[PDB]
RNA sequence: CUGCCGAAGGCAGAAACUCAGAUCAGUUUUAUGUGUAAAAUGAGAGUUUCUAGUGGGCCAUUUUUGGUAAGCAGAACUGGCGAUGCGGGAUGAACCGAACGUGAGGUUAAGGUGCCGGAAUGUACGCUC
């Protein structure tokens, strides 16, 4: 298996969310 | 001076008998 | 003589790159801390700590937080420039730069004119 | 080019300076546990090929020139062409007569003695 | 009779120290004149064509190498009034011994500067002299510092001071 | 005679161009490579996007542990990768087996991604070519047009390319080159040298970090 | 020294998830590596969110927005002790949360022998309110009127001639 | 009385050496008024000497020196490395050396 | 005397000849369940033949059962020792580095920088009488 490529990881639809230990 | 009564300095079978027997302590607490 | 960390206290860079400059404390951030700011361009403002700097004497008021701009009204209002040399403590140590910066024909104008100067030892009898 | 020598120092027998029975000539140790053997610190080192010296200079003496033992006039004729890089030196049995005999002989020659004021 | 192979290794003009500028005063580290101060005329090959006016410290035209010169901030010396152009490497050439076979009392009789020393080289440097000394006669202390002499005490640190 | 020097001359000389135009060529490609990455974070920020980079093919592993006390497998492994003394360097291509064979000699090595400087110093102060079984320096593109010249490599910055690009070729420029024997790095090693880089160490991956090493190592 | 990280990542899509959740963590490491690295196993512990199968899709270090005032910042910390567990909240004046961050871990290796694996970090705030400062020794520093002489003054060249001064 | 030293004082600390190793190739030395490797560059290159007495007279002289040459700093408080034409002997350990001025870089 | 090769708890070497191979690997991927099968990297791979020495043991490692105030005993693998000098742990058969031709220069590992001892009585934050 070859290394990913660049990609696109569109976050309108799901935006980061904060997450704590 | 050492102001001791009980040298602080360990003998060689003495610090290597720990080693020995620690870790057959964790054995057998395992 | 007493030098308490007070806001406003005028202070004398002793350690890193900025030593020789006269900077003011403006907050007192923590136990081993403190901000401080300086009319002169060419120091920036930074938090430094008490090991890197000798208090001075000269206290000027000045409100705590206070921006660079204001630092350099009221120092300039109440002439801390010159006020510190006034004091024969900067007059030592710009003699000593002063000192440092001479070189070998002016150290041989040293040489005479400390010899014209002892050239008298006139005492009265 | 000139002479280098890796080392000055001749290899002595272990334990020769403690015996005289002992002799000063060079004898690899072959007990398992010898110190020497085993080469620990501090102690008199042993021959190693490593020690050699360059083959360009190796077997020339401090002049350059590698000596050539000579016994009569025969043997100073055979370093005619080879004055440059031979040296003659005289046998220790050659007798007087012989000796100054060949010296005179080397000097027409013009070939390097090594002991020629003997 | 071996041919040794064509080195590659070209002779260039030195570079010198961009301090060392004909006209600046410089002190002797060592030499018989050690710790003496010089007037530099001019930039030779490799060393430089200097001396201190033989009036007031009695320095004579000599080379010193560049590395045991120690270049001063004092002001420059107007050494363009006096042709150089004449200290050349031939001029400064010392002959040839040929011969170790000398030194009974009689090449030392025979030496220093009554002999040897023509009248013609005593004739450029006064010349030298006398077109050098209107200039330090002019800047004030120039003629009392040449005439002194360069020396370290105590408290003194040379990688600190700055000549 | 002067026929036969001429046509040498001039074949030669057509030679050269052709090398100018390849490196040209390829230093215009890394630039472009390199703006284009920069353009893509730029308006992946601009519309609150994100924007993943390539993850890079070539990676650049260096052994940090003597020849002693090392298991049989890792000690075939370092085998298999040509690392058979300490502050060796070599260039694999990294892919997917690549990954778990390196995961087994991890506190014995450490990687990470080389950038183009990188991987130009070691090929011009480092590069020993591999000819006829013999470690020859590459001085000069006469040894690398007569060994690679099968696969399109003619010069030192063809050379370059085909390691620094990962190229169909890859594995035969690698094997082609001898491993780098780097010197003991300068100012030295952390205060542990065989913790993982993550905990303050020096073993295992560094990604970006492998740079830094490697100017020591030189 | 530390510098402050914003770690987003998530899993790779597939047929069952096609656009997985993308979770986005404030953490402090030397670098971009720990932090993934950093972020990885807290991602495990959290959500059981596997490195391999996983991916980080951001990475961005923060600097402060008012290196230029100082600030109260309370530290709520989580400690793997004897017994394995522990739960702690300190205060530090400082004008950067990363010296913040630093001072806590110096704090904490001085006081209850923690190193930087035993320590994980839940969350660090700011405390703009006089009043929510719980700590009595940041209170003393809050005072108005805040003096005090200078505190371990301690002052090659060996063989001073002079005795010292240690004084004003 | 003082118009002469045109050198700055030194002293002979040690060899350069490990723990149970000595190297009697380069030397250690201790350079009056330097107190930091930054210093010490100024004074890398300069010539060092050793002078000292014997009873023979040679050449009309009770006097021999041995030439040597400051190579790179040792340490962070100034001290130097020097390398001599003869390697100073093992009871000079204390011993003064002179460091000249020459060759001059400035 | 020197040099080279070099073990063993069926080996190492010698000679006689295959194929410029998909031929092997104290290895990792892929597929099927540590076994097997068919991509990565490295290496020139091999077959029959005869002929020296050895077939011991100590130390630690992870897998279990029998166990007791308390240690302990019996297995399998793994290495180190043994044939191995060198740096460090004050010194040392088993601890941390590092495998050794003769030298010059540079840089490190482990461990260290108050003095003995080569190297900061360095910087920064705490704790302790």
């Not at chain 2, 360990?10 to 290597?16: C, D, K, Q, V, Y």
């Not at chain 5, 200097?50 to 007031?56: F, S």
Request: some cysteine; glycine content about 6%.
């Amino acid at each position: 298996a070859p290394p990913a490529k660049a990609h696109f990881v569109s976050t309108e639809n799901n935006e980061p969310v904060t997450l704590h230990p | 001076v050492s102001l001791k009564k009980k040298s602080k300095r360990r003998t060689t079978r003495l610090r290597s008998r720990i080693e020995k027997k620690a870790a057959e302590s964790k054995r057998k607490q395992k | 003589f007493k030098r308490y960390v007070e806001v406003g206290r005028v202070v004398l860079v002793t350690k890193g790159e900025y030593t020789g400059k006269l900077a003011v404390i403006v907050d007192i951030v923590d136990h081993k801390r403190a901000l401080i700011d300086s009319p002169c361009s060419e120091f920036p403002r930074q938090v430094i700590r008490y090991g890197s700097v000798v208090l001075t004497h000269i206290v000027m008021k000045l409100p705590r937080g206070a921006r660079s701009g204001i630092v350099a009204k009221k120092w300039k209002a109440q002439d801390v420039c010159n006020k510190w040399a006034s004091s024969a403590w900067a007059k030592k140590l710009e003699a000593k730069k002063v000192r440092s910066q001479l070189n070998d024909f002016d150290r041989f104008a040293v040489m005479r004119l400390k010899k014209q100067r002892r050239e008298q030892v006139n005492v009265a009898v | 080019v000139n002479i280098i020598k890796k080392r000055t120092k001749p290899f002595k027998r272990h334990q020769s300076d403690r015996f005289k029975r002992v002799g000063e000539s060079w004898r690899k140790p072959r007990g398992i546990d010898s110190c020497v053997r085993r080469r620990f610190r501090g102690t008199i080192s042993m021959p190693k090929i490593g020690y050699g010296n360059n083959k360009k200079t190796r077997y020339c003496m401090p002049n350059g020139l590698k000596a050539f033992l000579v016994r009569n006039v025969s043997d100073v004729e055979l370093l005619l062409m080879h004055n440059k890089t031979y040296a003659a030196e005289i046998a220790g049995n050659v007798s007087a007569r012989k000796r100054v005999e060949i010296v005179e002989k080397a000097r027409a020659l013009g070939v390097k003695v090594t002991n020629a004021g003997a | 009779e071996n041919v040794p192979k064509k080195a590659r290794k070209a002779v260039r003009p030195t570079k010198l120290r961009a301090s060392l500028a004909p006209g600046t005063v410089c002190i002797l580290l060592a030499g018989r004149f050690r710790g003496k101060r010089v007037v530099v005329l001019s930039q030779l090959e490799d060393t430089l064509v200097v001396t201190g006016p033989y009036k007031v410290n009695g320095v004579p035209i000599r080379r010193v190498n560049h590395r045991y010169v120690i270049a001063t901030s004092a002001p420059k010396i107007d050494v363009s009034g006096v042709s150089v152009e004449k200290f050349t490497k031939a001029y400064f050439a010392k002959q040839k011994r040929s011969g170790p076979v000398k030194k009974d009392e009689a090449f030392f009789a025979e030496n220093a500067p009554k002999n040897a020393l023509p009248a013609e080289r005593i004739a450029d440097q006064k010349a030298v002299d006398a077109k050098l000394l209107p200039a330090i006669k002019a800047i004030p202390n120039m003629k009392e510092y040449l005439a002194a002499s360069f020396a370290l005490s105590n408290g003194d640190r040379p990688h600190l001071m700055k000549f | 005679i002067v026929a036969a020097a001429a046509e040498k001359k001039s074949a030669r000389q057509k030679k050269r161009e052709l090398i100018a135009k390849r490196a040209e060529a390829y230093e215009a490609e890394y630039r472009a490579a390199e703006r284009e990455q920069i353009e893509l974070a730029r308006k992946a920020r601009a519309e609150g996007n994100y924007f993943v980079p390539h993850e890079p093919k070539l990676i650049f592993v260096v052994r940090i542990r003597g020849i002693n006390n090392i298991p049989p497998k890792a000690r075939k492994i370092m085998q298999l990768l040509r690392l058979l003394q300490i502050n060796n360097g070599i260039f694999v291509k990294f892919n997917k087996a690549i990954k778990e064979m390196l995961q087994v000699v991890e506190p014995y090595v450490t990687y990470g991604i080389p950038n183009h400087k990188t991987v130009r110093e070691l090929i011009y102060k480092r590069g020993f070519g591999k000819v006829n079984k013999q470690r020859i320096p590459l001085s000069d593109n006469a040894i690398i047009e007569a060994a690679l010249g099968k696969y399109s490599i003619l010069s030192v910055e063809d050379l370059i390319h085909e390691i620094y690009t990962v190229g169909p070729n890859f594995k035969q420029a690698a094997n082609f080159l001898w491993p780098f024997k780097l010197s003991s790095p300068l100012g030295g090693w952390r205060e542990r040298k065989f913790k993982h880089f993550i905990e303050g160490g020096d073993a295992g991956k560094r990604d970006e970090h492998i740079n830094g090493l490697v100017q020591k190592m030189l | 020294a530390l510098k402050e990280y914003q770690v987003v990542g998530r899993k790779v899509p597939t047929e069952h998830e096609p656009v997985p959740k993308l979770f986005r963590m404030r953490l402090f490491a030397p670098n971009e590596s720990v932090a993934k690295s950093r972020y990885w196993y807290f991602l495990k512990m959290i959500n059981k969110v596997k490195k391999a199968t996983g991916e980080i899709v951001a990475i961005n270090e923060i600097s402060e927005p008012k290196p230029l005032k100082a600030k109260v910042f309370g530290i709520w910390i989580r400690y793997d002790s004897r017994s394995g567990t522990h739960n702690m909240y300190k205060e530090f004046r400082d004008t950067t949360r990363v010296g913040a961050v630093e001072a806590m871990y110096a704090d904490m290796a001085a006081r209850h022998r923690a190193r930087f694996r035993s320590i994980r970090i839940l969350k660090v705030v700011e405390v703009e309110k006089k009043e929510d400062v719980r700590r009595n020794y940041v209170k003393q520093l809050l005072n108005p009127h805040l003096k005090f002489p200078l505190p371990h003054r301690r002052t090659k060249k060996v063989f001073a001639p002079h005795r010292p001064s240690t004084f004003y | 009385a003082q118009g002469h030293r045109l050198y700055v004082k030194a002293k002979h600390l040690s060899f350069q050496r490990s723990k149970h190793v000595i190297h009697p190739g380069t030397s250690i030395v201790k350079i009056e008024g330097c107190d930091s490797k930054e210093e010490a560059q100024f004074y890398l290159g300069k010539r060092v000497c050793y002078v000292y007495k014997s009873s023979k007279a040679v050449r009309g002289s009770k006097i021999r020196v041995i030439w040597g040459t400051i190579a790179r700093p040792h340490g962070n408080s100034g001290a130097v490395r020097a390398r001599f034409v003869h390697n100073l002997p093992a009871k000079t350990f204390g011993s003064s050396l002179r460091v000249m001025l020459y060759p001059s870089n400035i």
